[PDB]
Amino acid sequence: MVKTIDTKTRVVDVTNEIAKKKYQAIRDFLEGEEFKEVVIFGVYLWGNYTAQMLSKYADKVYLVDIHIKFLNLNEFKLKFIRGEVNPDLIVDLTGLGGIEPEFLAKFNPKVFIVEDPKGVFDVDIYEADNTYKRTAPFIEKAKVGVLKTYRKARVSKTSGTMTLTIDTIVDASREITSLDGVLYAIPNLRYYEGILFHENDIHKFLSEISQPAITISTLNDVLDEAEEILSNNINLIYSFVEEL
Amino acid sequence: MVKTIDTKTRVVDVTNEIAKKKYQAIRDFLEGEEFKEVVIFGVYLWGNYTAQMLSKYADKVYLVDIHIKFLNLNEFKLKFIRGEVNPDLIVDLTGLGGIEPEFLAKFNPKVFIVEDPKGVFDVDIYEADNTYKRTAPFIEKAKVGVLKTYRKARVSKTSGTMTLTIDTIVDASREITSLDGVLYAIPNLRYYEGILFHENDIHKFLSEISQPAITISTLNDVLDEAEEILSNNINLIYSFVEEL
């Protein structure tokens, strides 16, 4: 009598949808701009989509994390000092406690893009943010953009893809719960970066992020309705680049 | 500067607290009465605590599942027909699509307790319920009670421990998210019965249910407040036995 239904939409599907929204904002800001060399700062798994897409607009793309060419920060710094890299385009996706503005100041790109980590107002997050301190040395000397991503009329503390994924899936599970005949809806979420970088478990990371977004205990088949709900909350997400 | 904090309270800790609440409701209703034989219908893990606690007031306790002596339904019926079992106390925790009223009618206990699965009103859940059809053959010939469990001024579709556990942890994660400096809060939940009874994976089941209830990404040490919030939502849960 009681049914168990997994959504066809996976967690990775939500993250990809969010990543696509963020890139489209970047692409629009870059419209009619061409590059030879692109450097992207941030963890790779959230920045990979942007890197793969920008490679069509570039001869060489560097994605730099603190752990297409993949480097940790220190290889990149030596490469920069040796004069082996000198990007026209810099995309900073590190956010809170990310790349230091003092390191950014050494570069001279044609276009500089930084992601605003702030979401809904939070006094501590607001205080910890230095997005516009990272933009200061490029203003008037480069095309500068600030990547912003918000949920329309919703609460998200940051604009991080992980944060948005979580709040999206959790809210969706609550809407699904209120449907007729539904007993509960489990949002299937995990701290993925902990699985990958602390436990170095590539296999468990792949299995966990590929899990159905929501598992539903229900008297009725609400799969299509659950999917629509999930789509509605994803479409709530709005991303754009503010030009400075 | 961004920290990741796990709650000390695990999912098992939350589920035990709720199960504990349900038993005390039962214990209050029985006022220290002792039985020769207790039969409890329902799944193991939500009903084991009640079985363990009632063993102090009973010579023999049977835990019957459709899957202290543990028996599945078919061993119990053959035992019942052979006349080896005839309980003074029957506790039915099966809920929706559970034990049939036609099977209950064969018994003659002194005390009969059935769990009302209904939570907040749901037309389909309400109609699928037959709790009072299970009490009917015992009304007047035994002490009859209906176990009810609600979240005060909150929405839960059923009174099931699993349902309450999910809604408790998810709501707590949302309140934690609203705290200063918190980026997000992950509710660590999984369909546990699917891991254990479908997949026969006791190892993965114990690991998943022992997960910290909530994983927090935060700028501040918010552990104590997170525990308190989690504790507060548990205290919202009210359980009692309605005597008919």
Cross-chain residue pair A188–B187, CB shorter than 8 Å: no
Residues A113 and A212 grouped into a single domain: no
Tokens 């019965």 locate to B193
Residues A181 and A139 grouped into a single domain: no
Residues A95 and A112 grouped into a single domain: yes
In the DSSP assignment, the letter for residue A42 is: S
Q: List residues bridging with A143 in a β-sheet.
A: A111
Cross-chain residue pair B220–A124, CB shorter than 8 Å: yes
Any idea what the Cα angle at residue B202 is, between residues B192 and B207, rounded to 5°?
65
Tokens 């419209």 locate to A31
Q: List residues bridging with B65 in a β-sheet.
A: B72
Closest CA to B144 of B153, B156, B132: B132
Residues A227 and A241 grouped into a single domain: no
A107's tokens: 């570069």
A188's tokens: 């299937």
CB A15 within 8 A of CB A165: yes
Domain count within chain B: 2
Closest CA to B221 of B11, B5, B66, B7: B5
Any idea what the Cα angle at residue B117 is, between residues B112 and B120, rounded to 5°?
140
Residues of B in contact with A220 (CB under 8 A): 124
Residue of A14, A186, A193, A218 to mutate, testing the B interface (most B Cβ within 10 Å of its Cβ): A186
Residues of A in contact with B96 (CB under 8 A): 1-2, 183, 219
Q: How near does any CA of chain B get to the CA of A215, in Å?
A: 7
CA A7 – CA A13 distance, rounded (Å): 11
Q: What type of residue sits at position B54?
A: L
Cross-chain residue pair B191–A128, CB shorter than 8 Å: no
B5's tokens: 């904090």
CA B65 – CA B123 distance, rounded (Å): 28
C-alpha dist (Å) from residue A222 to A182, A213, B163: 8, 14, 18
Q: How near does any CA of chain B get to the CA of A122, in Å?
A: 6
Cross-chain residue pair B180–A122, CB shorter than 8 Å: yes
Q: List residues bridging with A182 in a β-sheet.
A: A218
Helix (H, G, I), strand (E, B) or coil at A25: helix
Residues of A in contact with B190 (CB under 8 A): 186, 188, 215
H-helix or E-strand spanning residue B183: strand B182-187
- Cα B18 → chain centroid: 7
CB-nearest to B4 from A183, A184, A191 is A191
Q: How near does any CA of chain B get to the CA of A7, in Å?
A: 13
Encode burial over A213-233: b for 16+ CB neighbours within 10 A, e otherwise.
Answer: bbbbbbbeebeeebbebbeeb
Residues B169 and B223 grouped into a single domain: yes
Helix (H, G, I), strand (E, B) or coil at B111: strand
Task: Please give the residue range of the domain that contains residue A188.
Answer: 2-9+153-235
Residues A120 and A240 grouped into a single domain: yes
A103's tokens: 């390191």
Q: List residues bridging with B37 in a β-sheet.
A: B60
What residue in A sits closest to B155 (Cα-Cα)? A178
Residues B124 and B17 grouped into a single domain: yes
Residues A25 and A140 grouped into a single domain: yes
Contacts 24+ apart (CB under 8 A), A25-28: A25/A147, A25/A149, A25/A239, A25/A240, A25/A241, A26/A50, A26/A54, A26/A91, A26/A113, A26/A147, A26/A241, A27/A53, A28/A240, A28/A241
Residues B14 and B113 grouped into a single domain: yes
CA A168 – CA A154 distance, rounded (Å): 10
Residues A87 and A180 grouped into a single domain: no
DSSP for B136-158, written as a single string:
GGGBTTBEEEEEEEEETTS--SB
Closest CA to A173 of A3, A11, A1, A15: A11
Scanning chain A, the segments in alpha helix (DSSP H) are 11-30, 44-54, 73-81, 101-104, 123-128, 131-135, 161-177, 192-197, 202-209, 223-235
Residues A118 and A59 grouped into a single domain: yes
CB-nearest to B177 from A97, A157, A220 is A157
Q: How near does any CA of chain B get to the CA of A183, in Å?
A: 5
Residues A76 and A144 grouped into a single domain: yes
| Number of cross-chain residue pairs from A and B with Cβ atoms under 8 Å apart | 112
CA B68 – CA B64 distance, rounded (Å): 11
Strands B89-92 and B69-72: unpaired
- Cα A155 → chain centroid: 17
CA A185 – CA A7 distance, rounded (Å): 10
Cross-chain residue pair B181–A124, CB shorter than 8 Å: yes
Residues of A in contact with B155 (CB under 8 A): 177-178
Closest CA to A40 of A98, A89, A77, A109: A89
Scanning chain B, the segments in alpha helix (DSSP H) are 11-30, 44-54, 73-81, 101-104, 123-128, 131-135, 161-177, 192-197, 202-209, 223-235
CB B243 within 8 A of CB B174: no
- Resolution value (Å, 1 decimal): 2.4
Helix (H, G, I), strand (E, B) or coil at A26: helix
C-alpha dist (Å) from residue A133 to A40, A91, A129, B151, B211: 18, 15, 9, 47, 39
Residues 6+ apart with CB under 8 A from B63: B40, B42, B44, B47, B48, B51, B69, B70, B71
Alpha-carbon dihedral angle through residues A164, A168, A174, A175, given to the nearest 10 degrees: 150
DSSP for A152-193, written as a single string:
TTS--SB--HHHHHHHHHHHHHHHHHTSTTEEEEEE----HH
